[PDB]
């Protein structure tokens, strides 16, 4: 018995109806559950037996049974529930879950704030060295972030990471480090950052000069 | 309160093993089934094992078969997975849970959970990590300053980061690590705040890294 998760992630405003469906290999019984879990935390028992409310559970979750198909519903949206959600097939002696489906919000366009960190001296003292540009409560998570030193465009040797949605403005932030040598970081001295991205007319620059 | 603790997982190689704990309080062990779930890095969930302890009754998935063994000390109220033969794709976060049931048989579900306990199975070493400023600027951009921590150079998953002990929560961004060139994670952990504010509260972030056994307190200042 197995469980396949539709859709694989969807994109929604707060107070839309969104639905996740789980269809079954075989037939299976209302022995289906739903959980969400947020990034980094265990997974919260939403739904059991397929249509019954865990206590605690807010009203805007429900579940239904259609035949082989299963389905978990979220009335309206709401900026806390961005999680990815999972259903599970068993009794407690074996339990198979689905592949999960990643629920992200939809909302207004925010730019992002920009910041730029230099290197530390106790940081370069350790032979390295690692700029960092932030990028803060912005929103789509799409953006584009240049490092130019010395008003040269650098490839290859930077790399960035991004948080997951924010759980009250569902605004996302960004943060990438250029890693050089402290003998490369030295030899150059005007170190920048140029953010492109949707909320921005035209893109943000900052910058630094070493020392 | 019914509690359940994971223990016992961390850097182990490939072909080792290692015997995971889940300790629970608030109920016996005896009366519900005890499960281990395991997800890997940026994937989903799979469930490894059961066990019914009273009547010592196990119950395993076909990938952890012949290696994995779930035992229970209801002495110790306590849940054990044993792991042999440990390969890569068994790198995961075990949570250990324990499974409710309708009252009427309609079915049930995994009530209440642990933390997790990260399971590296890796041949590198483990190394501590060096903790930088990232230090203040001149900058005001909205009126905003945004200070914070480099965790740099470690090995294994995970390191936690607060700002000063959890107290301070509010504008806080702390990004996932990222595997570098070196083969070692990296990650940083910033902190938003109004720029008159500089002068008046201090700001230190605690880094843990259990697997090196590295608990930091650095303070950050500008300049």
């Known amino acids: 018995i197995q469980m396949t998760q539709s859709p694989s992630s969807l994109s929604a405003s707060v107070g839309d109806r969104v639905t996740i469906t789980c269809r079954a290999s075989?037939?299976?019984?209302?022995?289906v559950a739903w959980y969400q879990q947020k990034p980094g935390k265990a997974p919260k028992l939403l739904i059991y037996?397929?249509?019954s409310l865990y206590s605690g559970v807010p009203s805007r979750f429900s579940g239904s049974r259609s035949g082989t198909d299963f389905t978990l519903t979220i009335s309206s949206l709401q900026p806390e529930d961005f999680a990815t959600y999972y259903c599970?097939?068993?009794?407690?002696?074996?339990?198979?879950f689905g592949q999960g489906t990643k629920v992200e919000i939809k909302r207004t366009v925010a730019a992002p704030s920009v910041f730029i960190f230099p290197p530390s001296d106790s940081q370069l003292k350790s032979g390295t060295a690692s700029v960092v540009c932030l990028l803060n409560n912005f929103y789509p998570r799409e953006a584009k972030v240049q490092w130019k030193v010395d008003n040269a465009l650098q490839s290859g040797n930077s790399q960035e990471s991004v948080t997951e949605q924010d759980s009250k403005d569902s605004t996302y932030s960004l943060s990438s480090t250029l890693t050089l040598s402290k003998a490369d970081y030295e030899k150059h001295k005007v170190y920048a950052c140029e953010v492109t991205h949707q909320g921005l007319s035209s893109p943000v620059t900052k910058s630094f000069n070493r020392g | 309160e019914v509690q359940l603790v994971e223990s016992g997982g961390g850097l182990v190689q490939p072909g080792g093993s290692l015997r995971l704990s889940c300790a629970a309080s608030?109920?016996?062990?005896?009366?519900?089934?005890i499960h281990w779930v395991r997800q890997a890095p940026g994937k989903g969930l799979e469930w490894v094992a059961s066990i019914y302890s009273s009547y010592g009754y196990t119950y395993y998935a076909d990938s952890v078969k012949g290696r994995f063994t779930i035992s229970a000390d209801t002495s110790k109220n306590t849940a054990y997975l044993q792991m042999n033969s440990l390969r890569a794709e068994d790198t995961a976060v075990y949570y250990c849970?324990?499974?409710?049931?309708?009252?009427?048989?309609?079915?049930?579900?995994?009530?209440?959970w642990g933390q997790g306990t990260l399971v590296t199975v890796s041949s590198a070493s483990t190394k501590g990590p060096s903790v930088f400023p990232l230090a203040p600027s001149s900058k005001s951009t909205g009126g905003t300053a945004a200070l914070g921590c480099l965790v740099k150079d470690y090995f294994p998953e995970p390191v936690t980061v607060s700002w000063n002990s959890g107290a301070l929560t509010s504008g806080v961004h702390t990004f996932p690590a990222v595997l570098q060139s070196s083969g070692l994670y990296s990650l940083s952990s910033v902190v938003t705040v109004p720029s008159s504010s500089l002068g008046t509260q201090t700001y230190i972030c605690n880094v843990n890294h259990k697997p090196s056994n590295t608990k930091v307190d650095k303070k950050v200042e500008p300049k």
């Open positions: 037996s397929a249509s």
């Open positions: 599970q097939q068993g009794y407690g002696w074996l339990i198979t």
């Open positions: 075989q037939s299976v019984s209302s022995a």
């Open positions: 849970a324990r499974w409710w049931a309708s009252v009427g048989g309609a079915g049930g579900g995994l009530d209440y």
């Open positions: 608030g109920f016996n062990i005896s009366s519900s089934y």
